[PDB]
Paper text:
Signaling by the human C-type lectin-like receptor, natural killer (NK) cell inhibitory receptor [name]-P1, has a critical role in many immune-related diseases and cancer. Human [name]-P1 and [name] are type II transmembrane glycoproteins with similar protein topology: an N-terminal cytoplasmic signaling tail, a transmembrane helix, a flexible stalk region, and a C-terminal C-type lectin-like domain (CTLD). In addition, [name]-P1 promotes transendothelial migration to immunologically privileged niches upon interaction with its endogenous ligand, [name] ([name]). Here we report the crystal structures of the [name]-P1 and [name]-P1:[name] complexes, which provides evidence that [name]-P1 forms homodimers in an unexpected arrangement to enable [name] binding in two modes, bridging two [name] molecules.
Residue numbers in the entry:
A (entry chain B): 74 to 189
B (entry chain A): 73 to 188
The structure:
């Protein structure tokens, strides 16, 4: 189903970290579990993540270089559903939704993978 | 999907977190109608999962006791005492930090669980 301790929602499995890492180290961790930093594709998914995450900021799998659009982990372009606030290069969830920061900062993170 | 729509997956079970309130027996009747029971909360890990997702309101769980007698799960087995339960009530609920107890006729949100 989902691996031990991962949380199941709709067709995905989610890992919420206890520790903090920078964004690229977080994605390296997710990749080691055949997963990615969360690819949050829907409002229902966003709301599930906000409800479980607790008060800490958590990285998700959206990033950009300056003067380049937001990209998913696979390098394709993100199209807005919910907004990502600010001017940072890496995206995370705070208590109101998505925000952006410098990629070198340490936050908690969320991994996702398919349940299949 | 491992669980029905609106249910959350954890450790091979599916969890339902209510929006409305009911007394404890009426909550159990609702779970029963969905082929489930009020959540058993067998482990400390399950306790923490439920506290993280439930939100700020009190939620009934599937433990109850008669006058000065041990706590029992819905299924009739004696509780394995894996966390403290505060107070002097006959029905257990989760508050924001752990488990407590109240009179069974009082109204609260509830959590159901079933195998996936
Ligand atoms: C890339 O990832 C995004 C987000 O999960 C997905 O919508 C898109 O279909 C994927 N594209 C490819 C070519 O895999
Ligand atoms: C990200 O963190 C790792 C340590 O986990 C470190 O090796 C690397 O220097 C960091 N990258 C940046 C941009 O700070
Ligand atoms: C009763 O439920 C508990 C709590 O989940 C479970 O661990 C135990 O096996 C059950 N007992 C019986 C007799 O089914
Ligand atoms: C519990 O609530 C139900 C209806 O929701 C009601 O029929 C019953 O009287 C209540 N039980 C107690 C002990 O008050």
């Amino acid at each position: 189903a989902c691996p031990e301790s991962w949380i199941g929602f709709q067709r995905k499995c989610f890992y919420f970290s206890d520790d903090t890492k920078n964004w690229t180290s977080s994605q390296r961790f997710c990749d080691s579990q055949d997963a990615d930093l969360a690819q949050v594709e829907s409002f229902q998914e966003l709301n599930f993540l906000l409800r479980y995450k607790g008060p800490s900021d958590h990285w998700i799998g959206l990033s950009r270089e300056q003067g380049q659009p937001w990209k998913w982990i696979n390098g394709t372009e993100w199209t807005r559903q919910f907004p990502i606030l600010g001017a940072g290069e890496c995206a995370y969830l705070n208590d109101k939704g998505a925000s952006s920061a410098r990629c070198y900062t340490e936050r908690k993170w969320i991994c996702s993978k398919s349940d299949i």
